[PDB]
Design an enzyme around this catalytic site. Sequence first.
Site, short mmCIF file in Angstrom:
data_model
loop_
_atom_site.label_atom_id
_atom_site.label_comp_id
_atom_site.label_asym_id
_atom_site.label_seq_id
_atom_site.Cartn_x
_atom_site.Cartn_y
_atom_site.Cartn_z
N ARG A 83 -8.62 1.82 9.75
CA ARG A 83 -8.28 0.42 10.04
C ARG A 83 -9.23 -0.24 11.04
O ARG A 83 -9.01 -1.39 11.45
CB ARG A 83 -6.83 0.32 10.49
N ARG A 106 11.38 -6.85 4.37
CA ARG A 106 11.31 -5.40 4.29
C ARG A 106 12.43 -4.75 5.07
O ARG A 106 12.72 -5.15 6.21
CB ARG A 106 9.97 -4.92 4.85
N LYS A 109 0.81 -1.23 0.00
CA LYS A 109 0.00 0.00 0.00
C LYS A 109 0.83 1.27 0.00
O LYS A 109 0.60 2.17 -0.81
CB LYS A 109 -0.98 -0.02 1.19
N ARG A 127 0.21 -8.92 13.90
CA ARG A 127 -0.36 -7.91 13.01
C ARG A 127 -1.37 -8.50 12.03
O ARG A 127 -2.38 -7.87 11.73
CB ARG A 127 0.72 -7.14 12.24
N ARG A 136 12.34 -2.83 10.67
CA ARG A 136 11.37 -2.33 11.65
C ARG A 136 11.19 -3.34 12.78
O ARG A 136 11.21 -4.54 12.55
CB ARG A 136 10.00 -2.10 11.00
N1 LIG Z 1 4.21 -6.04 -5.53
C1 LIG Z 1 5.27 -6.26 -4.76
N2 LIG Z 1 6.02 -7.37 -4.90
C2 LIG Z 1 7.10 -7.62 -4.13
N3 LIG Z 1 7.48 -6.84 -3.10
C3 LIG Z 1 6.76 -5.74 -2.87
C4 LIG Z 1 5.59 -5.39 -3.66
N4 LIG Z 1 5.07 -4.23 -3.17
C5 LIG Z 1 5.85 -3.87 -2.13
N5 LIG Z 1 6.85 -4.77 -1.96
C6 LIG Z 1 7.82 -4.84 -0.87
O1 LIG Z 1 7.08 -5.51 0.18
C7 LIG Z 1 7.19 -4.83 1.44
C8 LIG Z 1 5.87 -4.21 1.84
O2 LIG Z 1 5.56 -3.07 1.03
P1 LIG Z 1 4.89 -1.79 1.74
O3 LIG Z 1 4.60 -0.82 0.65
O4 LIG Z 1 5.73 -1.33 2.90
O5 LIG Z 1 3.49 -2.45 2.22
P2 LIG Z 1 2.36 -1.80 3.18
O6 LIG Z 1 2.48 -0.28 3.08
O7 LIG Z 1 1.06 -2.34 2.62
O8 LIG Z 1 2.61 -2.33 4.60
C9 LIG Z 1 8.28 -3.83 1.25
O9 LIG Z 1 9.49 -4.46 1.64
C10 LIG Z 1 8.25 -3.56 -0.27
O10 LIG Z 1 9.55 -3.25 -0.73
N1 LIG Z 2 -5.30 3.70 11.18
C1 LIG Z 2 -4.60 3.16 12.22
N2 LIG Z 2 -5.18 2.82 13.38
C2 LIG Z 2 -4.49 2.29 14.41
N3 LIG Z 2 -3.18 2.07 14.37
C3 LIG Z 2 -2.50 2.35 13.23
C4 LIG Z 2 -3.16 2.94 12.11
N4 LIG Z 2 -2.24 3.13 11.15
C5 LIG Z 2 -1.05 2.69 11.65
N5 LIG Z 2 -1.23 2.20 12.91
C6 LIG Z 2 -0.20 1.68 13.82
O1 LIG Z 2 1.05 1.74 13.16
C7 LIG Z 2 1.54 0.41 12.87
C8 LIG Z 2 2.21 0.40 11.51
O2 LIG Z 2 1.25 0.55 10.47
P1 LIG Z 2 1.67 0.86 8.97
O3 LIG Z 2 2.96 1.64 8.96
O4 LIG Z 2 0.49 1.45 8.27
O5 LIG Z 2 1.98 -0.52 8.30
C9 LIG Z 2 0.30 -0.47 13.02
O6 LIG Z 2 0.61 -1.84 13.25
C10 LIG Z 2 -0.43 0.21 14.17
O7 LIG Z 2 0.21 -0.05 15.39
F1 ALF Z 3 1.27 0.02 5.70
AL1 ALF Z 3 2.21 -1.28 6.50
F2 ALF Z 3 3.11 -2.54 7.41
F3 ALF Z 3 3.71 -0.35 6.35
F4 ALF Z 3 0.71 -2.22 6.50
MG LIG Z 4 3.13 1.09 4.92
#
Ligand SMILES: Nc1ncnc2c1ncn2[C@@H]1O[C@H](COP(=O)(O)OP(=O)(O)O)[C@@H](O)[C@H]1O
Ligand SMILES: Nc1ncnc2c1ncn2[C@@H]1O[C@H](COP(=O)(O)O)[C@@H](O)[C@H]1O
Ligand code: ALF
Ligand SMILES: [Mg+2]
Length: 203
Positions: A85, A124, A13, A161, A150
């Site tokens: 969320r 990641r 995302k 998670r 992280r």
């Molecule tokens: N389509 C994809 N295929 C493979 N790896 C990906 C893809 N999209 C993102 N990644 C990698 O996967 C991990 C999660 O992406 P991220 O954008 O941080 O996800 P989110 O924001 O949903 O938690 C990161 O390490 C990123 O580099």
């Molecule tokens: N909308 C939300 N509501 C509650 N906690 C959140 C939200 N967005 C992010 N978090 C917190 O931040 C962490 C990292 O989320 P994210 O970076 O979006 O993948 C989550 O596991 C939660 O602890």
């Molecule tokens: F948006 Al994430 F772990 F970075 F769901």
């Molecule tokens: Mg993210």
Amino acid sequence: MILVFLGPPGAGKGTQAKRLAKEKGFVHISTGDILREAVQKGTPLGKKAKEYMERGELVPDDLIIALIEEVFPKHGNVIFDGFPRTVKQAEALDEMLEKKGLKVDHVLLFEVPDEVVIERLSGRRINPETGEVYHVKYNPPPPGVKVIQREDDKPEVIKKRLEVYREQTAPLIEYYKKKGILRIIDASKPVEEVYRQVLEVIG
Ligand SMILES: Nc1ncnc2c1ncn2[C@@H]1O[C@H](COP(=O)(O)OP(=O)(O)O)[C@@H](O)[C@H]1O
Ligand SMILES: Nc1ncnc2c1ncn2[C@@H]1O[C@H](COP(=O)(O)O)[C@@H](O)[C@H]1O
Ligand code: ALF
Ligand SMILES: [Mg+2]
């Protein structure tokens, strides 16, 4: 145009939101990024949010709702990335937007199986100074870029998670389906193909 990106942790995302925002001029609101900034700065929000985040739990709704009230862009295009969320968060968002004569135009569900989520998250790595995201297999950082893992991308925390997502966040799929605004993308595909699918929705 107001977009919400919804899906399991690690679905991609953030990766897609950052690109869409730069290429098309959306303001990108990532609650995760904003919370990590608050933690760094040691604000009242950051100090309280930290231990939820470290455990892989959600930060309490009232804190997140206030945060979004404080940062929500008055005009122009917006991507809400990882917000809402919970159902209460989504109900609050709808209320906020309606008071402004706005609405969520599309909710993009990033569908991807658990096994894939677990590989993405376990590989990641982030630049802690910029928030830029890499992957040891699929997008490794270049020389000179220092990255870290992280704390919440540890195996036990990833497990928690995904549990939290299924219990608290996944109901949003039905919440938005019943507003008629949900669009499904296959986020298991490589990055370029996921981005094509994103562009298809918003077009
Ligand atoms: N389509 C994809 N295929 C493979 N790896 C990906 C893809 N999209 C993102 N990644 C990698 O996967 C991990 C999660 O992406 P991220 O954008 O941080 O996800 P989110 O924001 O949903 O938690 C990161 O390490 C990123 O580099
Ligand atoms: N909308 C939300 N509501 C509650 N906690 C959140 C939200 N967005 C992010 N978090 C917190 O931040 C962490 C990292 O989320 P994210 O970076 O979006 O993948 C989550 O596991 C939660 O602890
Ligand atoms: F948006 Al994430 F772990 F970075 F769901
Ligand atoms: Mg993210």
